[PDB]
C-alpha cells in the first residue's frame, strides 16, 4: 500500500467465489420451457450441462 | 299460456294487422313472466406454459 519503500505496509484483498449445482433429473419440455422463460439475477454465471 | 280476456276492435291502429295491444294489468299479474337459465362455464387448462 505504501507507493515507495514501507514493505512492511500491504493489504490483503480476496475475490470468493461461490459454486452451487442444481441437478434436475428427468426433464419435461413444460420443465424446460418455465426455465427458459423464467430470468435470473445479473452477475450470476450459469453454465449447462447436458448429460 | 294464459286464458286473456280480448276483444276484436281497432283501437288508434296500434293492433294494426298484425299488432297486439295489452293492457298493463296483464304484466302486473305477471300472467306471462319465464324464467331462463343461461349455463356459462369457465374453463381452465394445463397449457404449455
Known amino acids: ?51 | 299460456g294464459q286464458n286473456m280476456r280480448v276483444a276484436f276492435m281497432p283501437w288508434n291502429g296500434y293492433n294494426f294487422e298484425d299488432s297486439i295491444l295489452v293492457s298493463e294489468r296483464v304484466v302486473q299479474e305477471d300472467r306471462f313472466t319465464t324464467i331462463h337459465i343461461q349455463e356459462l362455464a369457465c374453463v381452465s387448462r394445463d397449457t404449455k406454459l
Do not use: C, F, W
Not at chain 1, 13 to 21: A, F, G, K, P, V
Not at chain 1, 24 to 45: Q, S, Y
Open chain 1, 1 to 51: 500500500i505504501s507507493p515507495h519503500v514501507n514493505k512492511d505496509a500491504r493489504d490483503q484483498y480476496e475475490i470468493r467465489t461461490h459454486l452451487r449445482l442444481v441437478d434436475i433429473v428427468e426433464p419435461t419440455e413444460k420443465t424446460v420451457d418455465a426455465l427458459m422463460r423464467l430470468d435470473l439475477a445479473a452477475g450470476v454465471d450459469v453454465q449447462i450441462s447436458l448429460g
